[PDB]
Amino acid sequence: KHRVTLRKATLASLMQSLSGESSNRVMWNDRYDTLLIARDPREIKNAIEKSVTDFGGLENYKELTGGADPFALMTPVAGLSANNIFKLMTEKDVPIDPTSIEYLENTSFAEHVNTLDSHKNYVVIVNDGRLGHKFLIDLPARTAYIIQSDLGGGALPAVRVEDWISRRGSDPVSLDELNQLLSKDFSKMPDDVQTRLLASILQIDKDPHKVDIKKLHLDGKLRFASHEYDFRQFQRNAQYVAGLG
C-alpha cells in the first residue's frame, strides 16, 4: 500500500509536465513504430513546421483544420491517450505498436483476468465498439484503475485526461462491475443498470445523470488486449517525458 502513493506521484508528475511544450508534443505524438522515449521534440516540431509550410503557412493551415493550430498545447482524445499511455507503460527497449496489437473478441473479461499472474502488473487496452471509446485498465500486482480521456460525442461526456487522473486516477474500481460492463450481455441490460455501470466506472463524478445511453451502439463490438509491465520501466519512461522542460 506504499506503491499506490508512488503510482499517484508518478501520474501527477506526468500530467503536470504536459504544460511543457516539449513534454506535450512527445507524450501525445502519433508515431507508434518507435520507442516513445526515442521521440525528439525538435524533430517533431520540424515535422509540424513542415506540414504548416507545405500548406501555405499557419493562417492557411488553421483555415484547413477549421481553426486548429498544430503548435498549441493539446489534450488527447480517447484513442490517442490510450495508445500513448499504453506505450509509456509497457515499453522498455522494444517498440510496441498499439495499432498492430491483436485483440481478444471471443473471451470474457472475467475469464481472461483469471489467467493473469497476480504477482505481475497488467495494463488492459479496451477498444469498446458499444461506447465508441478506447480506454485503459491498470491491473497492479486484485486492484483496478481506469485511465481515459473522452471527446464527448458518445454516452460519456467529454473528459480531459489530466482531470481524469486527478479525480479518478487513484480511485480503485470494482472488479466485478468491470465484468458486467465488459460483457457482451451489457448491450442487453436494463437502461438504468447500463447507466449506473457507465457512471460508476467511467464518469468523473460517478453520476448517472451525466450518462446518455441513447447514444450507445448496441451492436458495437467489445475488444480488448492486456500486456504485462514493469513498474520501474513505466516510472522511467514517465521521467523522460516529464523531464523535457
Partner: protein
C-alpha cells in the same frame, strides 16, 4: 476509383484508396484500422468543416488527391 490523404496535426500521413460513393463512416473506420482511434473519437475535417457520419465523400465534394485532417484532441485547452 480515387485517392485521398489523411493528415494529423503531427504531419503524419496515410493514403486511402477510395470511391466518391464511400461513407464518412467507411473512411473513419479505415482510419481506426491504421491509427487505432474509434470513429466516434475522431475530428475528421475537410475544407474547414467537421465530417459527419451518414454522408458520403461526394456529399462534401471531396475529390481526387484531396486531403482530410485528423484532429485528435479535445476542443480548447
Amino acid at each position: 476509383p480515387m485517392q485521398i490523404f489523411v493528415k494529423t496535426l503531427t504531419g503524419k500521413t496515410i493514403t486511402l484508396e477510395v470511391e466518391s460513393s464511400d461513407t464518412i463512416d467507411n473512411v473513419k473506420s479505415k482510419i481506426q484500422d491504421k491509427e487505432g482511434i474509434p470513429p466516434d473519437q475522431q475530428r475528421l475535417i475537410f475544407a474547414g468543416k467537421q465530417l459527419e457520419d451518414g454522408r458520403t465523400l461526394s456529399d462534401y465534394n471531396i475529390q481526387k488527391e484531396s486531403t482530410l485532417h485528423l484532429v485528435l484532441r479535445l476542443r480548447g485547452g
